[PDB]
Design a protein around this ligand. Structure first.
Ligand SMILES: *Cc1cc2c(cc1C)nc1c(=O)[nH]c(=O)nc-1n2C[C@H](O)[C@H](O)[C@H](O)COP(=O)(O)OP(=O)(O)OC[C@H]1O[C@@H](n2cnc3c(N)ncnc32)[C@H](O)[C@@H]1O
Length: 541
């Protein structure tokens, strides 16, 4: 690969390396980018000032799992961009148990698994964890990362825990900010009006460290079911049988993975226990995360199907879905993983980077908890109709599963330190005009990158969701980390990117704390737009 132009008078003590860039899904691949690993937060400041003086941009580089082009854009000229790998050195972790609520301070490059592993050593933990522990905390906060957790009916939220996004747990953070004449480190407390836009910032701000509250750790069971027909699981409100709503009411945490052209989803249900005290007799105790080995490692017949699909055989979809379901059903049985139990992190962390690479569509439906069944029944029935509609024309734009899970919102009551409010632009931010809306229902669809017609379908779905879930009883918000603004390619519908996202985030909230308030804060902190790229300029001018 041709060497990139040498950056002018780059700091001599900050080593620069030319490396390729590839996000997890591999949808974003650049043969060359400049990368460095700042040893301390002050080195990021030095980078920012150097970047400003030479018209270069700086992007923090976490675990590179990002689908949304917030680091680098596909095919973009990055001759004037420096990527700052934060996981090399900015990964310190310190637990603070002296105060009103326990907290943990971590460099922005520390992985969430590393953070919660340390919390576990102090009998502490987080209630709503994202599925993969490899994510950097900086990258997780940037998109209001979350899990599939909700408290069961009657279950109280323990002091320190939140069922909203990880962004709601921040008690303080430090970022590189313009002080009027130069960039410098600045720290903000949760009771500081200037902090809310920074809690979920999409990488528009460069965080060097964060402090987050933690609640007591807890034991949790995770039961899997693959014997419930989809129409029963996703039935109308009040239906009898093994319904999604009944699982959420009884256990709180739940996630369904429904493979294309299959009869029964893989349903996971998490239940908190009331040192084996509380372990269900039938459950297998685990002492580590990632207990679904069959999903993080696929056999030849399956890898061959994936290879053939990539070679231009989308018609394999009707065989691929069932094959994935069978691997799951058989794998869960063979490894005795249908009923496991252990500490929170061990049953909530279940996705390894080795899982099949997929791209996603869909989003979040913010509404009242009593509306869960209806939202899910409507979506699944619509999806079912659409996939068959295309099959009827000999088209297979969908070869990945439908994934559905709910969690809470960034409730103010969960914050145990003085606070001015929830993250300004998190999809999990409560709606003031609708106090009864207390859950976020994540409706996602996954598919193999490059599948013909897939993005056209995601656009069709995005349009249906916006029209269907924006009413007096619910609001639709794209999941920042996934695909959205499909035009048809994700992030290319100019009207959605430059007008509708703003509209979504000014709706129902004060003019003193909305999308515009956030943009203003981001620009005040970085008036020279050092922490941006082309896409960010369209989304957050
Ligand atoms: C790959 C993947 C991701 C994923 C998932 C499963 C897989 C296989 N499961 C998720 C889950 O269960 N729940 C959830 O909410 N998200 C899940 N994701 C998506 C993941 O959260 C996002 O992709 C996340 O942003 C990725 O974090 P990562 O650590 O990989 O970071 P990155 O791609 O480099 O950058 C992502 C964004 O974060 C900003 N960023 C990164 N570091 C910082 C610092 N220091 N300061 C400010 N912003 C930061 C980047 O700019 C970018 O916008």
């Amino acid at each position: 690969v041709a060497p990139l132009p040498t950056p002018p008078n780059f700091p001599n003590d900050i080593a620069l390396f030319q490396q390729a860039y590839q996000n997890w899904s591999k949808e974003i691949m650049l043969d060359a980018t400049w990368v460095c690993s700042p040893k301390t937060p002050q080195d990021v400041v030095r980078l920012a000032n150097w970047a400003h003086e030479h018209d270069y941009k700086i992007r923090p580089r976490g675990a590179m799992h990002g689908w949304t082009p917030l680091t680098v854009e596909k095919g973009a000229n990055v001759e004037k961009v420096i990527l700052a790998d934060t996981m090399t050195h900015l990964n310190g972790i310190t637990v603070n148990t002296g105060g009103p609520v326990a907290t943990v301070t971590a460099g922005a490059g520390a992985s969430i698994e590393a953070i919660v592993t340390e919390l576990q050593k102090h009998d502490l933990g987080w209630a709503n964890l994202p599925a993969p522990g490899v994510l950097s905390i900086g990258g997780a906060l940037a998109v209001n990362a979350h899990g599939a957790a909700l408290p069961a009916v009657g279950q109280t939220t323990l002091p320190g825990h939140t069922y909203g996004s990880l962004s709601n747990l921040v008690t303080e953070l430090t970022a590189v900010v313009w002080n009027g004449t130069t960039y410098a480190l600045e720290t903000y407390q949760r009771n500081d009006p200037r902090i809310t836009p920074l809690l979920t910032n999409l990488g528009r701000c460069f965080l060097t460290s964060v402090t987050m509250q933690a609640g007591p750790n807890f034991r949790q069971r995770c039961q899997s079911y693959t014997d419930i027909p989809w129409r029963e699981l996703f039935a109308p409100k009040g239906a009898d049988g093994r319904t999604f709503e009944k699982f959420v009411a009884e256990s709180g945490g739940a996630e369904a993975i429904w493979y294309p052209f299959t009869e029964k989803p893989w349903m996971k249900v998490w239940t908190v226990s009331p040192s084996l005290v509380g372990k269900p007799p039938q459950a297998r105790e685990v002492s580590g995360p990632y207990n679904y080995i069959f999903s993080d490692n696929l056999p030849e017949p399956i890898t061959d199907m994936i290879g053939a699909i990539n070679a231009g055989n989308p018609g394999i979809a009707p065989l691929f879905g069932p094959a994935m379901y069978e691997i799951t059903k058989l794998g869960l049985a063979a490894t005795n993983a249908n009923d496991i139990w252990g500490w929170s992190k061990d049953v909530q962390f279940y996705i390894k980077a080795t899982t099949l690479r997929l791209t996603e569509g869909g989003g979040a439906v913010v509404t009242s908890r009593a509306n869960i069944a209806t939202v899910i029944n409507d979506f699944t029935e619509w999806f079912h109709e659409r996939i068959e509609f295309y099959r009827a024309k000999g088209e297979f734009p969908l070869n990945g599963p439908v994934e559905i899970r709910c969690c809470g919102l960034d409730q103010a009551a969960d914050v145990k330190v003085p606070s001015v409010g929830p993250p300004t632009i998190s999809a999990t931010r409560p709606r003031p005009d609708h106090p009864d809306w207390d859950v976020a229902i994540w409706l996602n669809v996954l598919g193999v990158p490059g599948t013909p017609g897939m993005f056209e379908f995601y656009r069709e779905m995005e349009q249906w969701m916006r029209s269907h879930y924006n009413n007096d009883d619910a609001t639709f918000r794209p999941e920042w980390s996934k695909g959205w603004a499909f035009g048809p390619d994700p992030y290319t519908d100019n009207d959605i990117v430059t007008n509708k996202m703003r509209a979504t985030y000014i709706e129902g909230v004060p003019t003193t704390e909305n999308w515009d308030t956030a943009r203003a804060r981001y620009n005040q902190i970085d008036p020279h737009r050092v922490f941006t790229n082309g896409f960010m300029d369209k989304l957050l001018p």
